[PDB]
Design a protein around this motif. Sequence first.
Motif: not given
Lengths: 23, 17, 83, 206, 60
Positions: C66-83
């Motif tokens: 409840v405290g949060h913005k909706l943007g806190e729950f849909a991240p914008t960068r996809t990462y999954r690490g180097h390797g």
Amino acid sequence: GKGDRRTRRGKIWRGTYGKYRPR
Amino acid sequence: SKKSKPGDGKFGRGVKR
Amino acid sequence: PRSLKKGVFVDDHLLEKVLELNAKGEKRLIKTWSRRSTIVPEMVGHTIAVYNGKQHVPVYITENMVGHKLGEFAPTRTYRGHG
Amino acid sequence: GNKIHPIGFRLGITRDWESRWYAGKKQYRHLLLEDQRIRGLLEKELYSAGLARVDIERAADNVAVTVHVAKPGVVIGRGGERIRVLREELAKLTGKNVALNVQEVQNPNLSAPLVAQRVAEQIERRFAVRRAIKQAVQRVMESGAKGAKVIVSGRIGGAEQARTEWAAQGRVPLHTLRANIDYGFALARTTYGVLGVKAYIFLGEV
Amino acid sequence: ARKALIEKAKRTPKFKVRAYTRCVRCGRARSVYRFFGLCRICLRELAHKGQLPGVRKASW
RNA sequence: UGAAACUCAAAGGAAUUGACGGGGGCCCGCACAAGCGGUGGAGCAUGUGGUUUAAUUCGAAGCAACGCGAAGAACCUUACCAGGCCUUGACAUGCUAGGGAACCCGGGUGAAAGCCUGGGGUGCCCCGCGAGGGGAGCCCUAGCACAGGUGCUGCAUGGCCGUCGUCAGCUCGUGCCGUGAGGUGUUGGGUUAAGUCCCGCAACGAGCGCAACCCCCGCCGUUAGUUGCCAGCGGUUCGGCCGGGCACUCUAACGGGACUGCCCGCGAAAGCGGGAGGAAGGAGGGGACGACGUCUGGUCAGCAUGGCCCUUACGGCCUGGGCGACACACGUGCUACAAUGCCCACUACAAAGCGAUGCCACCCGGCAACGGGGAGCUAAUCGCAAAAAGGUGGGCCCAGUUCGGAUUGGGGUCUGCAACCCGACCCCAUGAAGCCGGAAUCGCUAGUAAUCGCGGAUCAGCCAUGCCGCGGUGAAUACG
Ligand SMILES: [Mg+2]
Ligand SMILES: [Mg+2]
Ligand SMILES: [Mg+2]
Ligand SMILES: [Mg+2]
Ligand SMILES: [Mg+2]
Ligand SMILES: [Mg+2]
Ligand SMILES: [Mg+2]
Ligand SMILES: [Mg+2]
Ligand SMILES: [Mg+2]
Ligand SMILES: [Mg+2]
Ligand SMILES: [Mg+2]
Ligand SMILES: [Mg+2]
Ligand SMILES: [Mg+2]
Ligand SMILES: [Mg+2]
Ligand SMILES: [Mg+2]
Ligand SMILES: [Mg+2]
Ligand SMILES: [Mg+2]
Ligand SMILES: [Mg+2]
Ligand SMILES: [Mg+2]
Ligand SMILES: [Mg+2]
Ligand SMILES: [Mg+2]
Ligand SMILES: [Mg+2]
Ligand SMILES: [Mg+2]
Ligand SMILES: [Mg+2]
Ligand SMILES: [Mg+2]
Ligand SMILES: [Mg+2]
Ligand SMILES: [Mg+2]
Ligand SMILES: [Mg+2]
Ligand SMILES: [Mg+2]
Ligand SMILES: [Mg+2]
Ligand SMILES: [Mg+2]
Ligand SMILES: [Mg+2]
Ligand SMILES: [Mg+2]
Ligand SMILES: [Mg+2]
Ligand SMILES: [Mg+2]
Ligand SMILES: [Mg+2]
Ligand SMILES: [Mg+2]
Ligand SMILES: [Mg+2]
Ligand SMILES: [Mg+2]
Ligand SMILES: [Mg+2]
Ligand SMILES: [Mg+2]
Ligand SMILES: [Mg+2]
Ligand SMILES: [Mg+2]
Ligand SMILES: [Mg+2]
Ligand SMILES: [Mg+2]
Ligand SMILES: [Mg+2]
Ligand SMILES: [Mg+2]
Ligand SMILES: [Mg+2]
Ligand SMILES: [Mg+2]
Ligand SMILES: [Mg+2]
Ligand SMILES: [Mg+2]
Ligand SMILES: [Zn+2]
């Protein structure tokens, strides 16, 4: 030291005021 | 085949847009 | 954080899309672009499709989001690490 | 690329501004636009007269533009009528009472900005660049000057490899501040690009 | 993305936070002085020209 | 003694101008040496490589790319990505046909943009007791000519900049030498910061450079005397506050002053060593100023521009995202590791700048950020503003600490339509690494290095620890 916001020294550095360096 | 660097595989053209 | 003297912020255009559902018996899958909107206690139980710049991420809201913005729950960068 | 602007270097010494006025912080800039926009029109419309120096004076809610034209016959036109249709055209930009003098040219062959335009047109008209530079520098020194230097840079003769060509006579001491060097620049468009023309006239010292 | 943004700076915008200086001479969106309305390049061009009232290459 | 096949457009001689040598000679530069502080280790700030990504826009590349373009990326910026939208278009000129407008307040849809919309009511000269119909700022609908492109080429260009290098050099005219490229002058002895200057000479002069004229600082004068100053008397709520005054300090404009001028000593002279006067002495300290040229140096993304390319889209508007990613590597920095220090209270001394939707005195609410009230100032007057290191007093007692202040939890403040990605600041809590940094490596020769704080540009706010300035305190060393 100047990185310490919680003293008169840190406040002069960041140039702000508060409990620890009032004006 | 479009704008600017990097190239899209056609002379002169790049990938943007 | 926003001055609590000022208003807890919702875009208004998203909040009306909600209250109507509440009224005429919710819930449709509501999509928006207001990442900056605050999760408002009315919203609980709905799912909101928040744009991540690319897609609309389905977000199911619960009492404790409840405290949060909706943007806190849909991240914008996809990462999954180097390797 | 190294050397400083010969005029910019002597403001307060040998050279006067081309705009004279004071204005407070709250609208120095607004004036500045009008000025630049002013010379826009005049360097645009009065190129054919051979324009050499637009001097813009200001006092308050009025203006005094002084145009320094080589052939003032083109400026004033058929009976104070050209100079009028422009003094009227200037109000449409100025808004204020646009008071417009026309000042004679001493000796056109002693106006660095003029020489430049004369050479730029010759290179615009397909004449030998090297020759045109030696000729221009001759005409200056004959007009009793103490030195002259003209510099062409670009695709001379249309050569693919760009080149610098220049010619200099008399003396030109660009390190001396009491020297009075009229400097001017002209740009010359062609079918194959653009060429820059810099003309230096040394008018004697102080 | 040039002319459309020279125009769009002049427009008055949905919010005043979207208002930015641009050079009135060339249109640069960076290093613009509010005093002149000029960018740092144009500034230096018109300066050396004398077309800048009472402006003078400082030195001290 | 002595071929040929095959193959090449040269192989060569001498000499010229350069460049080059782990060749020579003579010089110079924080070049080393002599010293003082640091970087390389740590944590963090920022830039970059790399990788990642729908996108992580594009450029800079040894010195001379890497806190660089960026002197202000949450939206804007923005040039990138996803999506939703416009097609003479956001903008310029000009031509038509219709409405016949102009412009200012709405409404429906939608994240907005956009699409669909609802109103009123315009001169202009006119034939007007007339129905009225033309024409014209400028809007809109279609339709053309055209606009648009931060798409490519910096190896087609202008402009501007970097750089060798403030280095002492680069040349020309005529004469002379040489078949000629070229040489001479510019070499040579001496001197200088210097192709500075002296003497010598088949050369004699001249130009670009050096120096000089410009600026700030150091002594003195004239001119001025408020908003600045207060020497000596008059008041004085004891503040130059008031009388008053412009001496002084200052402010800011015009001059003076240093010239190797004078004395000695060397010398052909140029100069060089020393001395005196003097605020300053050998260019007094600092700045601005950058030779012909080099690097096919940089920049088509500031701008200009030839050519190539796109045309319901490589153009234009929007909402959101990204430019802030993170196994990693490098650069430039900030803060430290402590006692020559850290902390609290009280108390001194600057300079340069900024400031009428700005600087904010002062009063109150708040531990505070801040908030509310609220004077003065278009500012030598009012404000930012307290300078900090210092000085005095107390506290700590050599501990990963009252050293250090990262990281995380919580609670607030302000700017802004809005601080999830991705803002600064405030307070409670937390209290990491770090015990002086491997091989390596940087800066500075004096008011310099080091240390201390203050301002400005940009800017709503700010990721500035950056940058351009300002003064406080103030060394060490140079044999060579
Ligand atoms: Mg790439
Ligand atoms: Mg052609
Ligand atoms: Mg802005
Ligand atoms: Mg700007
Ligand atoms: Mg040989
Ligand atoms: Mg050393
Ligand atoms: Mg470092
Ligand atoms: Mg490090
Ligand atoms: Mg990269
Ligand atoms: Mg990059
Ligand atoms: Mg590019
Ligand atoms: Mg920044
Ligand atoms: Mg953006
Ligand atoms: Mg080039
Ligand atoms: Mg260039
Ligand atoms: Mg390049
Ligand atoms: Mg040489
Ligand atoms: Mg000769
Ligand atoms: Mg001969
Ligand atoms: Mg010769
Ligand atoms: Mg000689
Ligand atoms: Mg030489
Ligand atoms: Mg030589
Ligand atoms: Mg020679
Ligand atoms: Mg010789
Ligand atoms: Mg020198
Ligand atoms: Mg006096
Ligand atoms: Mg000089
Ligand atoms: Mg290149
Ligand atoms: Mg371009
Ligand atoms: Mg181009
Ligand atoms: Mg676009
Ligand atoms: Mg956007
Ligand atoms: Mg960046
Ligand atoms: Mg490292
Ligand atoms: Mg830093
Ligand atoms: Mg301040
Ligand atoms: Mg600890
Ligand atoms: Mg440890
Ligand atoms: Mg501790
Ligand atoms: Mg502490
Ligand atoms: Mg928190
Ligand atoms: Mg944010
Ligand atoms: Mg210890
Ligand atoms: Mg060390
Ligand atoms: Mg270190
Ligand atoms: Mg030195
Ligand atoms: Mg310190
Ligand atoms: Mg600062
Ligand atoms: Mg700021
Ligand atoms: Mg940050
Ligand atoms: Zn500009």
